[PDB]
């Protein structure tokens, strides 16, 4: 079976959903953790410095 | 408009509540007429009815009911 | 005449001698069955605490903290590293155990602030220190002309910024002259070179 097109057919699972905390569709409903704001893992909001050029 | 602030304050706590429940019903019947696509409207009032209600509520808080 | 305190001090100069020696052998046994952070009604070293700022007053807390001995508990590298940085065993942290203690204690008492801390011995693997903490919200401390300074907002979380006792000493700020070129007025401002 091709890992391409023919393997695209089984993708009827729901994972990342609208996050109750930040409103982005990144709340992983299996993990109960948001990939965007960290809701469900961190009380503090997710944020890293590599999200921007070092000097900015 | 047809209902000023002085007049709301010249009411007794029991008169505002009576006036309130009065406006709420005018409003509620206004909305029913609108919900039925009713044209006998006068948009300026359904708007006023909301402001009058706010004022009354505002005063109720000021006077302590 | 010598203060009664002066005796408590004298005894602790050589914690492995005479009476205090047998006291430690006794205590530690109970200590090793105690938690990481245990509040205690009275300082084991009265002279010490009082000397540091302690007072048998409302809003003043003391707690004994157990920290593991030895170098840094470090994980080996999982990617490319030059020999110099393939280190594991001999690497030691730049924060002394006493300072770790101060922090652990402080976290256990979120509303309190660290005043000072002192050692109370160690066995083969532990190291115990007692930390004096203060409730910057309790009047009597707000009203104490000798401690009310710690109630100031500018002092929120003193330990975590190293504004402590051992904090400043650990930051190499002891000397005012030669040697402190990279220490004062702050390690970070000196580009982290001490």
């Amino acid at each position: 079976t091709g890992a391409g097109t023919p393997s695209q057919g089984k993708k009827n699972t729901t994972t990342h959903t609208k996050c109750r905390r930040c409103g982005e569709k990144s709340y992983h409903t299996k993990k109960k953790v948001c990939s965007s704001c960290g809701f469900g893992k961190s009380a503090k909001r997710r944020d890293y410095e590599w999200q921007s050029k070092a000097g900015e | 408009t047809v209902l000023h602030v002085q007049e709301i304050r010249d009411m007794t706590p029991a008169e505002r509540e009576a006036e309130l429940d009065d406006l709420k019903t005018e409003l509620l019947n206004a909305r029913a007429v609108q919900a039925a696509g009713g044209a006998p409207e006068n948009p300026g009032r359904i708007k006023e009815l909301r402001k009058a209600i706010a004022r009354i509520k505002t005063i109720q808080g000021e006077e302590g009911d | 005449a010598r203060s009664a305190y002066s005796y408590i001090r004298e005894a602790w100069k050589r914690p492995k001698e005479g009476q205090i020696a047998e006291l430690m052998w006794h205590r530690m046994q109970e200590w090793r069955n105690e938690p990481a952070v245990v509040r205690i009604e009275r300082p084991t070293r009265l002279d010490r605490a009082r000397s540091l700022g302690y007072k048998a007053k409302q809003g003043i807390i003391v707690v004994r903290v157990a920290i593991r001995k030895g170098s840094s508990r470090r994980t080996r590298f999982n990617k490319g590293r030059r020999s110099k940085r393939m280190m594991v065993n001999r690497i030691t942290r730049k924060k002394n155990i006493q300072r770790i203690a101060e922090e652990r204690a402080n976290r256990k008492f979120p509303n309190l602030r660290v005043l000072n801390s002192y050692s109370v011995g160690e066995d083969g693997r532990h190291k115990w220190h007692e930390v004096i903490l203060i409730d910057p919200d309790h009047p009597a401390i707000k009203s104490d002309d000798q401690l009310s300074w710690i109630s100031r907002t500018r002092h929120r979380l003193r330990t975590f910024r190293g504004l402590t006792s051992a904090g400043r000493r650990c930051r190499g700020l002891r000397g005012q002259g030669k040697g402190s070129e990279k220490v004062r007025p702050s390690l970070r401002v000196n580009g982290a070179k001490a």
Binding site: - | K24, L28, R31, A32, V33, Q34, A35, A36 | -
Partner: protein
């Protein structure tokens, strides 16, 4: 504080229920239970509510189908508004 009744839901189907089954349909706040819907209705129109059916609509609001006792007449209650 929110009010239970929002406004009368008037549509061809609502009409049929009112004319043929003595039922009044309303747009009610979605936090309102059938019982709350029942009381509010009786108090607002002075009638006897027999049964209430609810449905959360694809309009973001809750719809309530209220049946009045044979004693009352929906057609008449609705005609005064």
């Amino acid at each position: 504080s929110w009010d239970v009744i929002k406004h009368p839901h008037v549509t061809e189907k609502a009409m049929n229920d009112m004319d043929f089954q003595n039922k009044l349909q309303f747009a009610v706040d979605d936090r309102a239970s059938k019982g709350e819907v029942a009381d509010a209705v009786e108090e607002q129109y002075d009638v006897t509510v027999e049964q209430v059916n609810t449905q959360n609509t694809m309009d973001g609001e809750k719809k309530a189908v209220v049946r009045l006792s044979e004693d009352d007449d929906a057609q008449e209650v609705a005609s005064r508004i």
